[PDB]
Amino acid sequence: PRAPRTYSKTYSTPKRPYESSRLDAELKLAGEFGLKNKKEIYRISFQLSKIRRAARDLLTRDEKDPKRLFEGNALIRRLVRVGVLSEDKKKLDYVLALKVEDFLERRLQTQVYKLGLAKSVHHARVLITQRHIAVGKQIVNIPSFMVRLDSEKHIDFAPTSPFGGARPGRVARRNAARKAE
Amino acid sequence: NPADKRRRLAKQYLENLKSEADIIASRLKEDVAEQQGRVFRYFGDKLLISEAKQSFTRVGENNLTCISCFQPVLNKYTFEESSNGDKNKGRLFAYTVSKDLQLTKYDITDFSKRPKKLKYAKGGAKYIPTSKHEYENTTEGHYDEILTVAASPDGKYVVTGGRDRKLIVWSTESLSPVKVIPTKDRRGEVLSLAFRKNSDQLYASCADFKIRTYSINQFSQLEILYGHHDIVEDISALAMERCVTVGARDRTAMLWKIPDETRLTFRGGDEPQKLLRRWMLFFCEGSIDVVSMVDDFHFITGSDNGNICLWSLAKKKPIFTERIAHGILPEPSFNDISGETDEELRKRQLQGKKLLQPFWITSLYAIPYSNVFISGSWSGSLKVWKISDNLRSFELLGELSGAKGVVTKIQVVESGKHGKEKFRILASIAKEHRLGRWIANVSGARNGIYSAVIDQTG
Amino acid sequence: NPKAFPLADAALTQQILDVVQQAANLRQLKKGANEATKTLNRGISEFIIMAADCEPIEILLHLPLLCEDKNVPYVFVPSRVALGRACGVSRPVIAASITTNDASAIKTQIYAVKDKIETLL
Amino acid sequence: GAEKALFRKNKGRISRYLANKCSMASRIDNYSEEPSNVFGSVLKKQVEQRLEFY
Amino acid sequence: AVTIRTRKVISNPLLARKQFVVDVLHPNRANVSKDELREKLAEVYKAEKDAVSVFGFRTQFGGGK
RNA sequence: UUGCCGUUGCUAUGGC
Ligand SMILES: [Mg+2]
């Protein structure tokens, strides 16, 4: 038979989901970032935990270790590229200082909100899911899309979108047709 | 069999070269070199700038805003001149616009003699549209500032537009308006015009951040191009449809492949901090203010930091730069910087050389497929530059100090045999910059057409 | 020490003039010394721009007196002809003002430039 | 100074024009350690050319 | 308008042909059928239509190419 | 050679 295709879980349930302080924390995160459910928060937390555990393991290694240098440098480059880690903080210690909010801001939903294309984070979500937002020349419909520094300046209304210069959507032309008739 | 016909045309063409005289072989490559989009007119070294016969001809109209020159050309494909009629055989014409809403044509056939006026047409308040609607802005004459002029390569029409959001095409012989094409935009003011070489296609750059393509023979609009984030101030065209434009403060030069409907991005991205470090005054570019195509695969631009940049289609960044080409402006006068009686107090306000700023490249024109181009400012002299053989750098060939004022637009015209060619440079001179009147009145600046005939010897 | 102070450098002036042109397109720019004075009186000015080559310089020194009284950042550019150019007006401008608007489409770069101007001060 | 007519249809234009010139004139004097009269002279001359025009 | 760009061109005289990847920009259009692509490629490379084969065409998410 | 006003020759350039 054909060789297996690997798969993995992108989120993990917390050690104690029932902490009241925690519950308030996810309430904050969902409310401010307009997240649909808790699974999104758990996913981001799992990714962050993997990153910081790798950083800790790298720190345990002695300085100038070739593995340390190579892998730490790669991790810092990736974190800088996605934009969570600022340029002036290129050391493994500050990686351990990252927070869930940093990743959350880089989500295409939040970036769309900040750029002024949407009046609410929920408005940003509905705009994205309705194929109105394009990074560069390509249309992205996924709120969880993570924006890179270079990609940030290229977010715009899609060419095919009615807001982006295309013809009016179905409702608009339907109303115009009935009005003319 | 049409191949026999080509052979006959080639045979007659070959006989011409024998009259023109290795030499035959080289000249054969040169004539078709227009087809291959590469520079093939290497005459910079043999040029004689110092002996140029300079002349300044005064003109009544104020702020001459642009000039367009028409030159008949022998076409190798059919071996016939481009003159519109038998009367116009080898007659050179120049058209000019001003902020006085007046069109004027001049005969520039006689290099030794100054431009001679033939006919003119003037606009005014009579031509204001009553309707107030964009699509009814179809009056015969102009009513607002005329900014640009272009002559059709066929010698049959001359087309002008300006801040009236209108483009009027006129008959060359009588300067009679034959068609009016509104831009149909609230802010669609025409800023530059360029005729495709040896074609009737016209490219118009408008203030509404768009480029509009027209067909003069059909008197109709064709397409609109989008992609600039700021006004499209200048446009240049060659035989091929790869017209180039500069978007002013968007600081991006753009090449448009019309049939491919794609557009190549070009940005300077130079920073003083690295320039000073590599040196271990430099003014950071704010806006690109002129563009002209030296080649199908190369073009040059001027900025508002006095930087002349050479470009190639392959590379996104500039390949060679000439910073502060026209020099730095005079320092502000100490008697006027401050009202302090004490002179030393006034000198402190000059703040050393920090307040000093560079000249702007108001004009920049390159002879097609050649190794020489001309730049202009209100420094009071026209500078002639020569590009290297490898097309990787250029050097200052010389200067012409006759011009005094803002050089709104530079044109070059050639005459004589292929071996012996005399180049006559015509530059419109004004007292204020074409797009507006920011510039402080330059001492001595006059409204006129500057002329300089240069002989070619070696 | 010089009356025009602080004076932006070649790099810094470009971003400032960049915001100026964007503000002019969006009707968020007030052009001329007289207008800038009015904005400072109303407390609707985000920050004020002046040209260091004003001839004479004194006729705009009243804005600095107003500015830090109202705790408004300000900065000088070397050129007025350049400042007028970016303003979109066919004449030189010695001073201009960026009107406050937290709903503006160009908010982010306005605060970015403002942060640098505060650092320069 | 519009209560005592210090600055005083065509007449009204001069008053507004003169008021502006007085304003910058005050600015030069106030923010000048040792004010001079060089600018005031030309500024008044500028008013004179504006005066004769109307 | 529709534009056809050929990339990664290889000349295989073993099989007596030319291989390439065809990228088709088709703004404001659903897609280009294999017939039009064949006739345009035949014109571009100056060959008989029957000598041009095209397949495996996928439009990216969002359309346009 | 200029819309106007001068100078300079028998042509060339100063100011608005
Ligand atoms: Mg759709």
UniProtKB/Swiss-Prot annotation, chain A:
There is a cross-link at K179 (Glycyl lysine isopeptide (Lys-Gly) (interchain with G-Cter in ubiquitin)). This is Small ribosomal subunit protein uS4A. The gene is RPS9A. One of its GO terms (biological process) is maturation of SSU-rRNA from tricistronic rRNA transcript (SSU-rRNA, 5.8S rRNA, LSU-rRNA). PANTHER family: 30S 40S RIBOSOMAL PROTEIN, 40S RIBOSOMAL PROTEIN S9. It comes from the Eukaryota. Residues 106-180 form the S4 RNA-binding domain. Keywords: Cytoplasm, Isopeptide bond, Nucleus, Phosphoprotein, Ribonucleoprotein, Ribosomal protein, Ribosome biogenesis, RNA-binding, rRNA processing, rRNA-binding, Ubl conjugation. Belongs to the universal ribosomal protein uS4 family. GO terms for molecular function: rRNA binding; structural constituent of ribosome. Component of the small ribosomal subunit (SSU). Mature yeast ribosomes consist of a small (40S) and a large (60S) subunit. The 40S small subunit contains 1 molecule of ribosomal RNA (18S rRNA) and 33 different proteins (encoded by 57 genes). The large 60S subunit contains 3 rRNA molecules (25S, 5.8S and 5S rRNA) and 46 different proteins (encoded by 81 genes). Interacts with snoRNA U3. uS11 interacts with MPP10. Component of the ribosomal small subunit (SSU) processome composed of at least 40 protein subunits and snoRNA U3. InterPro entries: Ribosomal_uS4 (IPR022801), Ribosomal_uS4_CS (IPR018079), Ribosomal_uS4_euk/arc (IPR005710), Ribosomal_uS4_N (IPR001912), S4_RNA-bd (IPR002942), S4_RNA-bd_sf (IPR036986). It is found in: Cytoplasm; Nucleus, Nucleolus.
Swiss-Prot record, chain C:
Pfam families: Ribosomal_L7Ae. The keyword Ribonucleoprotein applies. GO terms for molecular function: RNA binding; U3 snoRNA binding; U4 snRNA binding. Keywords: mRNA processing, mRNA splicing, Nucleus, Ribonucleoprotein, Ribosome biogenesis, RNA-binding, rRNA processing, Spliceosome. Gene3D superfamilies: 3.30.1330.30. Changing E55A: Impairs binding to U4 snRNA, but not U3 snoRNA. Causes pre-mRNA splicing and pre-rRNA processing defects. It is found in: Nucleus, Nucleolus. The keyword Ribonucleoprotein applies. It comes from the Eukaryota. One of its GO terms (biological process) is mRNA splicing, via spliceosome. Changing V77L: Impairs binding to U4 snRNA, but not U3 snoRNA, and causes pre rRNA processing defects and an accumulation of unspliced U3 snoRNA. Changing R80A: Impairs binding to U4 snRNA, but not U3 snoRNA, and causes pre rRNA processing defects and an accumulation of unspliced U3 snoRNA. GO terms for cellular component: box C/D methylation guide snoRNP complex; nucleolus; nucleoplasm; nucleus; precatalytic spliceosome; small-subunit processome; spliceosomal complex; U4 snRNP. Binds to the C'/D and B/C motifs in U3 snoRNA. Component of the U4/U6-U5 tri-snRNP complex composed of the U4, U6 and U5 snRNAs and at least PRP3, PRP4, PRP6, PRP8, PRP18, PRP31, PRP38, SNU13, SNU23, SNU66, SNU114, SPP381, SMB1, SMD1, SMD2, SMD3, SMX2, SMX3, LSM2, LSM3, LSM4, LSM5, LSM6, LSM7, LSM8, BRR2 and DIB1. Binds to the 5'-stem-loop of U4 snRNA. Component of the ribosomal small subunit (SSU) processome composed of at least 40 protein subunits and snoRNA U3.
UniProtKB/Swiss-Prot annotation, chain D:
It comes from the Eukaryota. Transmembrane segments: none annotated. It is found in: Nucleus, Nucleolus. Changing M24R: Reduced growth rate at all temperatures. Required for 60S ribosomal subunit synthesis. Belongs to the NOP5/NOP56 family. Interacts with NOP1 and NOP58. Component of the ribosomal small subunit (SSU) processome composed of at least 40 protein subunits and snoRNA U3. Present with 13500 molecules/cell in log phase SD medium. This is Nucleolar protein 56. It comes from Saccharomyces cerevisiae (strain ATCC 204508 / S288c). The lineage of its organism: Eukaryota, Fungi, Dikarya, Ascomycota, Saccharomycotina. The chain holds residues 337 to 415 of 504 of the full protein.
Swiss-Prot record, chain E:
The modification Phosphoserine is found at S11, S53. There is a cross-link at K18 (Glycyl lysine isopeptide (Lys-Gly) (interchain with G-Cter in ubiquitin)). Disulfide bonds: none annotated. N-terminally acetylated by acetyltransferase NatA. Also partially acetylated by NatC. Transmembrane segments: none annotated. It is found in: Cytoplasm. Belongs to the eukaryotic ribosomal protein eS24 family. There are 2 genes for eS24 in yeast. Component of the ribosome, a large ribonucleoprotein complex responsible for the synthesis of proteins in the cell. The small ribosomal subunit (SSU) binds messenger RNAs (mRNAs) and translates the encoded message by selecting cognate aminoacyl-transfer RNA (tRNA) molecules. The large subunit (LSU) contains the ribosomal catalytic site termed the peptidyl transferase center (PTC), which catalyzes the formation of peptide bonds, thereby polymerizing the amino acids delivered by tRNAs into a polypeptide chain. Component of the small ribosomal subunit (SSU). Mature yeast ribosomes consist of a small (40S) and a large (60S) subunit. The 40S small subunit contains 1 molecule of ribosomal RNA (18S rRNA) and 33 different proteins (encoded by 57 genes). The large 60S subunit contains 3 rRNA molecules (25S, 5.8S and 5S rRNA) and 46 different proteins (encoded by 81 genes). This is Small ribosomal subunit protein eS24A. It comes from Saccharomyces cerevisiae (strain ATCC 204508 / S288c). The gene is RPS24A.
